[PDB]
Nucleic acid binder design. Sequence first.
RNA 1: GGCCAGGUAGCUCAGUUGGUAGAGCACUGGACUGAAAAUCCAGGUGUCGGCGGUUCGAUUCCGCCCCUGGCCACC
Length: 367
Amino acid sequence: MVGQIAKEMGLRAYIVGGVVRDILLGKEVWDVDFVVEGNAIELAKELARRHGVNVHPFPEFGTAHLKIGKLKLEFATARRETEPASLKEDLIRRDFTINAMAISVNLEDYGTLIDYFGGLRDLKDKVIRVLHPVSFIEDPVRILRALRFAGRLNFKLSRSTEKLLKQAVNLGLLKEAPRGRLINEIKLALREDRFLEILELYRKYRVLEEIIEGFQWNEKVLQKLYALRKVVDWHALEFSEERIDYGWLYLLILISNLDYERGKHFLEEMSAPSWVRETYKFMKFKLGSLKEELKKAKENYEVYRLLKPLHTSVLLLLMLEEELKEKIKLYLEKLRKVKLPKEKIEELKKGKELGERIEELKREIMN
RNA sequence: GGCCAGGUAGCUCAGUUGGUAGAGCACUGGACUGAAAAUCCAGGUGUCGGCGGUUCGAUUCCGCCCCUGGCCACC
Ligand SMILES: Nc1ncnc2c1ncn2[C@@H]1O[C@H](COP(=O)(O)CP(=O)(O)OP(=O)(O)O)[C@@H](O)[C@H]1O
Ligand SMILES: [Mg+2]
């Protein structure tokens, strides 16, 4: 309907940015970004009115958001900076060529891909490339972004882009960038499935040393990250109904050697979930004694008592130990599964003494 | 969109090792009154947001959503 409305208003609208990329990569997304030559607000209002849905205008931003079905539509007026601006002037202000393309929703040329900067070629060559030499200097956050994309899509940085990125980091612009945008970019990164590869890129270009104060790389943490990858793969394979957010575990491994103060402060800035904070605080202190107790575990009910109250994350962190692995597994796919029939339970019931008795019966069954 | 609280009677508010729920003022009924109010006895004051899952058993553990407030990211 957008093409028709644009025709009636004598305008030109374009699907723009990441949405295009994802499409060419065969990935379908529910968030669609439009750039309009002319007033975007009125186009959005008319689209919303014709579909009979609510509209959310932002006149100062010159953008409007509306939702149709599961589609989230964002309409933005073309602008030459973050006189009317051409679509090209709006595309050239973006980060990377693969993000810089556009698909025309205008009726005459409809479907046509618009690529000024050679983003389709870079998409075909698996290349991450900035539009201009000052790109990373303009928005240091992009330093992370590039890596993320390279991590996600298994692309590589251009020679020029790699040089410029390294130069940007060397200028210390990572410290000059707003803390919020960087932290948010990292939050975006840990949601990736290829997040470990991104972390590798982080290590290579040494961006973590700038963002997290006191943080340094070593081999133990790295190997712990890969072992964590193995465990995460296995758990997300067999136990997949029980899945949680995995990237946070990697993050905990990274800051594991950091001071509790800096760790707590970073997890504070990251706005981490409660179970992340709890798992961190448990890892920093009680995890050691817990492991030493698991070493002293003989009967299965002791393992039960020591494990069952814990969260999934703590167990996954416990699986990092070779000797404890098969034990944790045995607890998972065997030990904690059991039940009792009617008459028996009825005899067991004849307060908290019922619970204690049930515990006695369970430890009687196990051992 | 991410996260943090908050969700407890009509309203304003506490409650952790899961094990049979509470206060201050409205609610009914009767004793009391010519009627009413007060007061006494008392007792509703509640699937402790909604829906699934784990558990013998979930306000509690977890997952998906609703509502409100605040930190933000809103290229
Ligand atoms: N720092 C930046 N500099 C220039 N453009 C940026 C940018 N950050 C985001 N964008 C632009 O905004 C558009 C997409 O917006 P976003 O949704 O915020 C990032 P994305 O590429 O779609 O991946 P994402 O959906 O996982 O966040 C892209 O055209 C992209 O070039
Ligand atoms: Mg997006």
